[PDB]
Write a protein that binds this ligand. Structure first.
Ligand SMILES: *[C@@H]1O[C@H](CO)[C@@H](O)[C@H](O)[C@H]1NC(C)=O
Ligand SMILES: *[C@@H]1O[C@H](CO)[C@@H](O)[C@H](O)[C@H]1NC(C)=O
Ligand SMILES: *[C@@H]1O[C@H](CO)[C@@H](O)[C@H](O)[C@H]1NC(C)=O
Lengths: 300, 97, 91, 96, 91, 48, 49
């Protein structure tokens, strides 16, 4: 039951450990996981924000969604050309889709994503230049053997897996309290049904649409309030409280499949052989590291 | 039988099997900072630790110099012994003395 | 993790928030814990009172110049714990 | 590679909860008392210092396990399938 | 290593080129050759018909958005061969 | 007062350059008994 | 008496002398990708060695 409709899904604020201000923060973009299994250095990134979809949720390339940490905590939309991925230098954005990115990146010890004009977020991830064969190279040469390797697909409609999705739980806003003169109240935004479950003197659960006096809460530290109409799905990140019902409401695709392909690997200098009795002396030339494997053609 | 940080740490009958079994040394820890994250620590995958020191495969370390192929698993062109052949030549090739 | 808000061109000494009330720290033992602003995360526009545990405005907020939110860290001793405040500026 | 996916915390505010032993792979679950969570929007529990968090963790195959996987085989005795060429009476005969 | 050209605001399905005819590869064994575009070099504006081996237009080509040319790669198995095609877009 | 990546020199410039550069071997510094690229979410909160 | 990958693999009586003689281990290879390049592989310079 894989769904490709993103109108039923909202982005989420993710708590990540290294923001731009060198401290953990809640960010609209949060790196959940990074996979580097392709043989061309392309990395796939799971980000708390969606990509290639507009605020409503329709397929709109070059505009992306994010849940903002401003006063109006709702989904906002922004241009995709002001987003950067980098490890040590900037990364070439190979592809994007909802919750997912794919990019060529230089070697480095960290992977970070930022929304320029900044909201950068960084995770530890050791990525290096990778082989395909038995000879080391920076880039494949014009003369080679064209061996079979596996690279991430740049087409977004393929599926390398699936992510389960769940309904979002309570969020318990702080801006819904009116502690004043020893008595507390609720701030409903524009008459919405922001509910409350809180323990002035005992467990009292209700739903208010207007500003409401509380029976026994003296301070505001022992009573909370949150929105109720939240029927937009969310990824099961460890940065949100699960609801009482935490079943798999839907499943989203994991794009950028590890598709097999051909890719060229170099051919080293052909060694010269000098023949001496029961043995050969091979004279070896290799600018880059190159594997030599010998085996006897017998029992041992 | 599984060991953390060793090959076969996570096993299943198939790739898409529901009955996944693993014994990775995973421990949950108390959240020190007042947030909603799940702090956990876990032993490194034994798959990567096996790829680190897998040694050389059977395509390079094999007696009698014959090459290993997969789908199906086989060792082609091996040269070690002798085959007894009992061959019945048809009489159309046998000619009068 | 404390999301606070301020308006545009707010005066000096105006209310930004109450750190100790929202974090549940006891007010009458704030001075014994060494309640201090973290020197790494210091904002010149805002200060906090050590005695009352209240974050307020030091310098008049210029929306054009600072931009995009402010970040301020606090720390306490015995036990040792830091906390983070993110402050939005309206337009 | 395992994915070691971590589900969302199960937080309730001063009620003691425990988690049932799920049959999912490498299921490790723990309960933490005295938590008082903060995600964006302030405190998540009204109740002061007796709230309980539930941390859950289990493993799962990585999305790239369709290619990057190792299969364990037990190998019994082998049999040969040899191809012969027989050139009796200058008549070529290829067989297996 | 092949050079093709397209006009501006071409519709879906319009002809761009014949990869197999230009490279000399026979059409009738393209299925046995494992003809396919390389998963790395893919563009959202141009695709290929694999049975005929004909590279054509999928999405309407936005001259402002894409810019500066389009690069594509195709590959075949037994023998293992890789080929490259560059497409100019006019204004 | 500036936060800088690891390097073997320090350069200060006035863009639009009249730059100046000196030798200064700066390295990524630690606080405890664990190498870390950046401080993690879960920790011990030692005094530094 | 030139040998590849060692000192004196290229020799002349002067820098501007036309009679330059050398025996570096150079080989020409069949081009794989269907272009007009010349794939060659040569022993390393014994001067730099
Ligand atoms: C809010 O809840 C009340 C409960 O009586 C319901 O009647 C109403 O339709 C809800 N929605 C509003 C006011 O938008
Ligand atoms: C194992 O991986 C490490 C990286 O942590 C590397 O330094 C080492 O060479 C690898 N191999 C062995 C045999 O330790
Ligand atoms: C062997 O060759 C001869 C002469 O070339 C030919 O006549 C004969 O048919 C061949 N032998 C057989 C068994 O067919």
């Amino acid at each position: 039951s894989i769904t490709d409709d993103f109108t039923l899904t909202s982005p989420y604020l993710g708590f990540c450990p290294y923001c731009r201000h060198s401290a953990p923060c809640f960010s609209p973009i949060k790196i959940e996981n990074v996979w580097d299994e392709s043989d061309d250095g392309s990395i796939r990134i799971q980000v708390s924000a969606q990509f290639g979809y507009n605020q409503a949720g329709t397929a709109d390339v070059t505009k992306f969604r994010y849940m903002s940490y401003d006063h109006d905590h709702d989904i906002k939309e922004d241009s995709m050309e002001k987003l950067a991925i980098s490890t040590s230098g900037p990364c070439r954005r190979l592809g994007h889709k909802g919750y997912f990115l794919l990019a060529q990146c230089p070697p480095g010890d960290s992977v970070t994503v930022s929304i320029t004009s900044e909201n950068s977020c960084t995770v530890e991830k050791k990525i290096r230049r990778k082989f395909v064969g038995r000879e080391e190279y920076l880039f494949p040469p014009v003369h080679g053997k064209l061996v079979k390797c596996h690279v991430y697909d740049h087409l977004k409609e393929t599926s390398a897996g699936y992510i389960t999705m769940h309904r979002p739980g309570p969020h318990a806003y702080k801006s819904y309290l009116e502690e004043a003169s020893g008595e507390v109240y609720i701030k409903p935004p524009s008459g919405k049904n922001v509910t409350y479950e809180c323990k002035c003197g005992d467990y009292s659960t209700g739903i208010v649409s207007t500003r409401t006096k509380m029976n026994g809460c003296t301070k505001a530290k022992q009573c909370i309030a949150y929105k109720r109409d939240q029927t937009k799905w969310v990824f099961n990140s460890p940065d949100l409280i699960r609801h009482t019902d935490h079943s798999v409401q839907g499943k989203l695709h994991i794009p950028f499949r590890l598709t097999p392909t051909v890719c060229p690997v170099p051919l080293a200098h052909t060694p010269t052989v000098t023949k001496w009795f029961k043995g050969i002396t091979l004279h070896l030339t290799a600018t880059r590291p190159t594997l030599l494997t010998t085996r006897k053609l017998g029992l041992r | 039988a599984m060991n953390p940080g060793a090959f076969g740490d996570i096993q299943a009958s198939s790739l898409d099997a529901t009955d996944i079994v693993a014994r990775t040394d995973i421990r949950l820890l108390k959240p020190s900072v007042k947030n909603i994250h799940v702090p956990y620590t876990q032993a490194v995958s034994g798959y990567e630790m096996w790829k680190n020191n897998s040694g050389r495969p059977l395509q390079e370390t094999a007696p009698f110099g014959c090459k290993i192929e997969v789908e199906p698993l086989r060792a082609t062109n091996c040269a070690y012994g002798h085959i007894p052949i009992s061959i019945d030549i048809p009489d159309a090739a046998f000619v009068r003395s | 993790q404390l999301h606070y808000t301020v308006q545009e061109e707010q005066e000096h000494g105006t209310f930004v928030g109450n750190i100790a009330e929202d974090l549940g720290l006891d007010i009458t033992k704030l001075s014994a814990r060494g309640f201090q602003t973290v020197p790494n995360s210091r904002t010149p526009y805002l200060d906090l009172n050590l005695e009352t545990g209240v974050l307020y405005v030091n310098e008049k907020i210029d929306r054009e110049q600072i931009c995009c939110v402010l970040h301020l860290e606090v720390f306490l001793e015995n036990p040792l714990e830091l906390f983070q405040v993110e402050i939005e500026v309206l337009d | 590679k395992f994915h070691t996916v971590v589900p969302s915390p199960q937080v309730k505010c001063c009620g003691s909860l425990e988690c049932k032993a799920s049959s999912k792979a490498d299921y490790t679950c723990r309960v933490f008392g005295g938590v008082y969570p903060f995600m964006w929007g302030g405190a998540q529990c009204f109740c002061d210092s007796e709230n309980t968090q539930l941390s859950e963790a289990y493993v799962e195959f990585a999305p790239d396990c369709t290619i990057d996987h190792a299969v364990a085989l037990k190998v019994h005795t082998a049999a040969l399938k040899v191809g012969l060429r027989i050139v009796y009476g200058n008549t070529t005969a290829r067989l297996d």
